[PDB]
Amino acid sequence: MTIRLVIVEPEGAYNLGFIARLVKNFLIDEFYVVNPKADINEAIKFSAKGSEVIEKMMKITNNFDDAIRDVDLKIATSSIADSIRPIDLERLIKDKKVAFIFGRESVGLTREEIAKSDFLLFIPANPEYPVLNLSHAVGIVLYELWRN
């Protein structure tokens, strides 16, 4: 069992640094970022000891296909506004290499990205306001994985 975190075209340097921190906090095995729009040098200021993740672990790809090679399962994420829940994860990911895919702050994921995913995970939240900030959604999912 190996977990790859894939972040697609992140825009906010704070979000990218916060995600890098979380990769260390929750011992995620692999970390890929597709065509980042955020300034990575600025992201490092938000990363605390996740700076090491940015510098040694993070793989930067220009295209989505190159971020999702050589895994057994791909799980995309979206809020209910735009399908499985975190409680489903343990059963699906047991003894698998799995990629968890998170989308852009402004626009989420494209049709390609969703087509290439096996499941779509939503974090239950206020139906009136179910959209979490990107890095907070990542943290919740990584916490759930750690619990397992």
Name the site residues for a copy of itself (rule: CB under 8 A). 14, 18, 21-22, 24-27, 46, 48-49, 123-126, 129-133, 135-136, 139-140, 143, 146-147
Whether residue 108 is annotated as binding a ligand: the answer is: no
Instruction: Please give the radius of gyration of the chain, using alpha carbons only, rounded to the nearest integer.
Output: 14
The CB density around residue 1, as the number of other CB atoms within 10 Å, is 12
Which of 48, 120 has the CB closer to a copy of itself?
Answer: 48
Segment near ligand SAH (CB under 6 A); pick from 37-45, 46-54, 59-67, 125-133? 125-133
Contact between 145 and ligand SAH by CB under 6 A: the answer reads: no
Which of 39, 66 has the CB closer to a copy of itself?
Answer: 39
At residue 81, the 3 state secondary structure works out as coil
108: phi then psi, degrees, rounded to nearest 5: 70, -135
Residues from 65 through 94 that contact ligand SAH (CB under 6 A): 77-80, 82
Whether residue 61 is annotated as binding a ligand: the answer is: no
Give 38's DSSP letter: S
At residue 36, the 3 state secondary structure works out as coil
Sole binder of ligand SAH in the list 5, 134, 142, 145 (CB under 6 A): 134
Query: How far is Cα 105 from Cα 25, in angstroms, rounded to an integer?
Result: 22
At residue 126, the 3 state secondary structure works out as coil
Report the binding-site residues: 77-79, 103, 123, 130-132
